[PDB]
């Protein structure tokens, strides 16, 4: 809905307090109980807090819900890395007769340790070449924080033609994964000495190489 405003993101360090504000108006937060909803990446939202201040079963005392006029606040004390997630406020709006939601807030836990990517690079399979196509697959995992750049080389000449790279995404262990695919013709693959996938992360490079000799 986003007739309720939350900030897009908030950042504390482990063990600190962080708050997520949710501002609306008298018809919504003003005169009605607020709920808080946690969303882990690509899973259903979970009720944390209802009736503005009450915790669901098995939610810890470290979470609290506050309300001051037309604003509501989510409090998280003794912040853990397990709290990284999207947080949504909800209420009723007696004007629109709608349930309403905030635009959501992304919680980042600061000072997590930097981690270089693992790179697996596969050459085209036999079966794919036999269907007259060629895909180089470069899988990139367990890197923190989640920002990488990927370059490809054919005998250390750069190739921009044919590249499709995922944006980074959060693994269950708070580290990030990404994929980059380079499409070739069987004759491009067979013609060159080697192809290279070089991933760059916090300025420092991890590179992998496959050859047709096989």
């Amino acid at each position: 809905q986003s007739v309720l405003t939350q900030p897009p993101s908030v950042s504390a360090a482990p063990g600190q307090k962080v708050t997520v504000s949710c501002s609306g108006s008298s018809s919504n937060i003003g005169n009605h109980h607020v709920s808080w909803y946690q969303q882990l990446p690509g899973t259903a939202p979970k009720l944390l807090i209802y009736d503005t201040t009450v915790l669901s079963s098995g939610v810890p005392d470290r979470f609290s819900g506050s309300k001051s006029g037309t604003s509501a606040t989510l409090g998280i004390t003794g912040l853990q890395t397990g709290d990284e997630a999207d947080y949504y406020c909800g209420t009723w709006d007696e004007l629109t007769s709608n349930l309403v939601f905030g635009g959501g807030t992304k919680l980042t836990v600061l000072g997590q340790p930097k981690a270089a990517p693992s790179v697996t690079l596969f050459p085209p399979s036999s079966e794919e070449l036999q269907a007259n196509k060629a895909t180089l697959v470069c899988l990139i995992s367990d890197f923190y924080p989640g920002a990488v750049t990927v370059a490809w080389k054919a005998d250390s000449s750069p190739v921009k033609a044919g590249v499709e790279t995922t944006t980074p995404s959060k693994q269950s262990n708070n580290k990030y994964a990404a994929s980059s695919y380079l499409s070739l013709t069987p004759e491009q693959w067979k013609s060159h000495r080697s192809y290279s996938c070089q991933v760059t992360h916090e300025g420092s490079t991890v590179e992998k190489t496959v050859a047709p000799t096989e």
Partner: protein
């Protein structure tokens, strides 16, 4: 246990219709309001519809008035969303939820969610290729083997290994979306290098929209 079992997403043409189901076990469903909430990818939660226990009373976001219809069969503990005159903007993950009231309203119990894609583009099942561990990466501790699940539409695909018996070591990557408008993803598993000469590695690729249910054996490279 108390749950909401959601079924019925997929691809449909602009103008077309889809029916979401959500079946209920563990509670007398017929007294509790339920709702439908949706989430476009990248974006946030939008309430869409709600219904009283009996069906007597039904509520709708302006974004869907005239087009979507919430209903329920209380004899089959089932909730529905009939979605008509769909547009590209309706492309979202749709959840059902139970709506309870104590001092205020809260949605406590949620379904897993189903993707609804509204596009003129056709269903295409993927090609499945084995990603065999290089000769080199084996003579040594561990081996990465995988399945390239290439050129499909729409999301999603599930990947298993060895009929679900092998879960440890499995990283299924999120799909890339090519300039072609088709999705490719890869699933990899790390295994003891020593198990390659005695153990069968099958990836099980399910793309429900194309009715693709494929099994692919991945075996180690010998070349050179």
């Amino acid at each position: 246990e108390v749950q909401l079992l959601e079924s019925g997403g997929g691809l449909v043409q602009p103008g077309g219709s889809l029916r979401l189901s959500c079946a209920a076990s563990g509670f007398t469903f017929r007294y509790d309001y339920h709702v439908w909430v949706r989430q476009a990818p990248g974006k946030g939660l939008e309430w869409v519809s709600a219904i009283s226990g009996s069906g007597g009373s039904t509520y709708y976001a302006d974004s869907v008035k005239g087009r979507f219809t919430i209903s329920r069969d209380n004899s089959k503990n089932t909730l529905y969303l009939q979605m008509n005159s769909l547009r590209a903007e309706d492309t979202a993950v749709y959840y059902c939820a139970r709506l309870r009231a104590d001092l205020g309203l809260y949605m406590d119990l949620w379904g897993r969610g189903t993707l609804v894609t509204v596009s003129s583009a056709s269903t295409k099942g993927p090609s499945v290729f084995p990603l065999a561990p290089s000769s080199k990466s084996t003579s040594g501790g561990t081996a990465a083997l995988g399945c390239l699940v290439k050129d499909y539409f729409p999301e999603p695909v599930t990947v298993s290994w060895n009929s679900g018996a092998l879960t440890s070591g499995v990283h299924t990557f999120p799909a890339v979306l090519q300039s072609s408008g088709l999705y490719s993803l890869s699933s990899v598993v790390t295994v003891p290098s020593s198990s390659l000469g005695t153990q069968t590695y099958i990836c099980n690729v399910n793309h429900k929209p194309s009715n693709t249910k494929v099994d692919k054996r991945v075996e180690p490279k010998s070349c050179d």
